[PDB]
Every structure is written in C-alpha cells, then in structure tokens.
Amino acid sequence: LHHALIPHGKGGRSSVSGIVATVFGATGFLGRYVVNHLGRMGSQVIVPYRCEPYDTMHLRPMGDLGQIIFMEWNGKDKDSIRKVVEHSNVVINLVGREWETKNFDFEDVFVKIPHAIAQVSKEAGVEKLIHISHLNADIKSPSRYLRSKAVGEKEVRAAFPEATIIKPSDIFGREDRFLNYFASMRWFGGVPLISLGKETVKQPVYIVDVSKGIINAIKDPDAKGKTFAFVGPNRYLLFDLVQYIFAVAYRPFLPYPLPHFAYRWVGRLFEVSPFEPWTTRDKVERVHMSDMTLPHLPGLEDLGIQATPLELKAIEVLRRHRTYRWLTSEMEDVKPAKTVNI
Template identity: 30%
Template sequence: MAPPLTCDRNFSLEDVHIEGAERIAEAVAKYDIDRFIHVSSYNASKDSPSEFFRTKARGEEIVRSIFPETTIVRPAPMFGYEDRLLNKLAGVTNLFTANHLQERFWPVHVIDVGTALSTMLEDDNTASETYELYGPTNYAMAEIAEMVDKEIFKRRRHLNVPKMVMQPTAKMLNQLLWWKTTSADEVEREFLDQVIDPNTKSFADLGITPAELRNYTFHYLQGYRSSAFYDLPPATEREKKEEKKYLHVIDDQ
C-alpha cells in the first residue's frame, strides 16, 4: 500500500510530523540548544480518526522524549495574509464540502500566534509546557463563510457531497493531480470539531488577548472585491450603520 499523501507526494504525514520532528529534536539535544518550541496542531490526539492529528500527537511525544524542555504549541486554524481559511472560503475553487461546513473551531490571528511564540522564546518559565492558542469566539465554518461572502460582495456556492463519496474521490484526485486539491484526511477533519484540552495553558498565561476574527475580514479580503465595491467600508461598519438607521426609524414611529 502506498503511504498517505500530503500536498507533496514525496513525503507522508508520518515522514513530516514524526520523523521530521524527531530529527529536529535530536539536533536540538545534540547541540544543547537553550529553547525549543515545537508547533503542533489543535486536536492532536493519538486516538483521532484523522491521521493528520494522530501523527501530530505522536510527534509531540517523540520531541518531548528526546528534549523534555520542549514547549509544545497547538494553534487553532489561523487567519491572516495567504491563510488557508479566509482565502480558501473566498476563492472560486472552494466548491465542495462533506459536512455542510458545520466543523466548529476557535480561529486565531496569526499575528497573535507569532507574538506568543516570541514571548515563549524569552520566557524560560514556558519550557516543558503545552499551550493551546485559539481565538475568543467559536464559529462553525458556515458562519465564517457567511462573513466572507458579506465582505467580498459575492456569494460562493458550497455543494455538499456525502463523505462516502467525497473521501475516495479526494484520495484519487490527490494521487492523480500534481497540484494541491484536497485529501481524504482533510475530508475526515471536516467532521472533527476543535476540542480544548483543559490541562494546557493558553494566551491568558502569556498576557496576550487574542484578536476577534470579524474585526479583520475586511483587512484580509478586500482584494477579492470587484472594483465597484473595493472602497466600501467593512461589513461590520455597514451592519452598524444599517442598525442605526433601523433604530432611528423605530424611534420616529
């Protein structure tokens, strides 16, 4: 059986998340590096039905066994320039889904994650700790998609395909096409909501207040607007203006 594929068909998830992490940890231990931060993933679990999350969890175990002072970081799905969240939802090729966009998670600003990593490097008290970094609000993917549509003044269609059809199709396309499409494991992850581990630390332990997604959709999606709408205000500002107009009409009545 061929190894499971990532976006690069030369390496499997095990190659990257386990063997790759092991080599880095061995180099850190060998050369007596002071601080080592291992960026894992939300939902990392050895019992997950997703191979991505299982191999992430195994990678965490290995780096800690080699270098116990490792700081492990599990960021939620991140938003920012060239992200795979807002840009994916705004793109014309994001057409098919298998779970009606019902996956739920706490999206986090990439800038906040970067700030947290920088803070950890300077704070020895973060050594050997595990941090889950996530935003302040839990969203369903469908709710984020609706925000994206309002911001870009376009309606992106999302056709739902049953999981039993979508998974084998994604697997076949991933093997046949050389460009990035999707994978059977990505389909599996659509059915896995983010679960917060209560035994881990978070932004609060670093003195950081995470940003709210809806305050940045305009900032990162303006380029998807047509020229006719390019300079209009963000959706949140438009909604506030409409609400004020509505309340004004009610008061007059």
C-alpha cells in the first residue's frame, strides 16, 4: 500500500487519508465541493487549471500546508495530462461546459478530453478513475450535450475498464445553474414554459450528496467498475418545481406557455453572446426533458448516503433572490410542492 500512503491521524486537516487525487475540472461548481471534501480528511489534491490563477484562490484554504498543488494543463495536450496524473492513485474528471465555445464543442469536452484523461491515467498506472456523466445521457437524445455524454462514457469505459461512472441528475446548490437559472427568469416578467412545464418530471439532487457520493465511491472497493445514478428523493413536475422555486424566493410567479420552435428561437438568440450565455438551445432542450428512471443502477444509498430533499436546502440557495422585505422568512414557511413519486 506504499507506506507513505498508509492512513494516519484522526481523519482531520492534519491527517493523512492515503488518497492522492488529480481533480480535472476542480475550478467549477462540483469541483470546489469535491476538493473541500478531499482536503477535509487530509488528502493530497492536485488541481489542473487552465484559467487565471486568481480564479483558483478559493481552493487554497481547503487543504493543510502542502496538500493542494496547482498545475497548468491544456485539454488538447496529453503531456500536460501525464504531468498532472503521474503521481496520483485517484483521478476524478469533472470537466464540462453547458455551452460551446469557438475552441471547444461538446464533443471536445465530453468525448475527446475524457478519453484522453482515461487513456493517460491507464498508461500512468492510476488505480482509480471516477468519470462523471449525465443521468439522461442518450445516443438518440435531442440534446447534443447528452449524445456527447453517452459517447464519452462509452469511450471512458473502453480506455479504463475499471472506471467508476457516476450519473447525477440536475445538481442544485449555492452556485448551481438550476435553481438560480429558474430564479433568474423573473427578470423577463413572465416565466416561459414549454407545455407550461406539465409534461416534464425532474429529480434534482443536492450538491453535497454528489460530492460525498464521489468520496465514498473512492473509499468503496466494490465501486471499482460500476455505474451509479445520483438522484434526489423526490420527483416533481417542472411547473410545480418552478412554482415552488418562486414561492421560496417570494417572487410573483407568472407562467405562460411558449411553443418549442419559439423557445428554440429565443435560445439561439441568446447563443450569440461571446460571454457566458444566459441560455442556449441545448439548455432549453435539457430543461424541458424528463429525467430517466433507472432502477437497475445503484444509487446514493448504495454508497451509504441518504439523499437530501430539496425542501430542506432550497432556502440556502434562494434566500439571495429575495427582496429586503422577505429576507428573514424561515424555511418551514413555504408549504413544499407536490411530488409525483410513482
């Protein structure tokens, strides 16, 4: 077990977990929680970054002295990947974008880069590989994002057969693009919903649940070559979910139905921004698509985690969206939304 990588201590900041993890995509939403959980117990964390170093500063306090190491990498350069995974026993891939840039399309970030990461990790002798996919990944999906996800998980399993593939469904959290995305739709007066959101079922999952699931899958020896689906405990209609979101934010909810073609036109219009788009056609397609039900796959409870319901954690995300008049309203004041749970 390589004596220097034998666990020591009480499992705290100054302890040694025995994990040496390279976390691709650590500067995003899920990455900060994963890095924080790794650094809590005394893991050595390697952060490959392509962004400005100022944009990694918030990850520095997450580990004890010497436990978080930052290195530049290029997604199109296999030598950078080899450099950042040379000394790791765990490689986590959290690289992803919800829009296409002029330099990276969905195939680049969801197929080519995961395949290169998996192949280089297999060459370098990395023992454990965690790859994140989507619950609704489908080769015949109307979303090219999900087609790329399905192709990429196929290639990751081809290049690293002992990989653990984790398929979450619409993670919600403080820095999420789900609860904040629906709460930022009020700036346009009404809320456009295809079919009034009455033909869409969502099963969102808490961010901390996903991060702890990744940690536990690392610590689980049986999780070696399995495929997990990380979903929340409740299923909601899109209409009811968005109405609940607006109730928690204490904003007036004015839903109106917009046809698929007009919503696609709006998404393409917003797609022309050189900055981070407010929405895209792919985002429009994914928002109005029902979450798949996959009972045959193991879930969070197979890793020892009871899924956190949305009703206990919606306020920690949506309190920021309230006016001054409603900031102090307590959590149990909103009367949770109806659930279609089989």
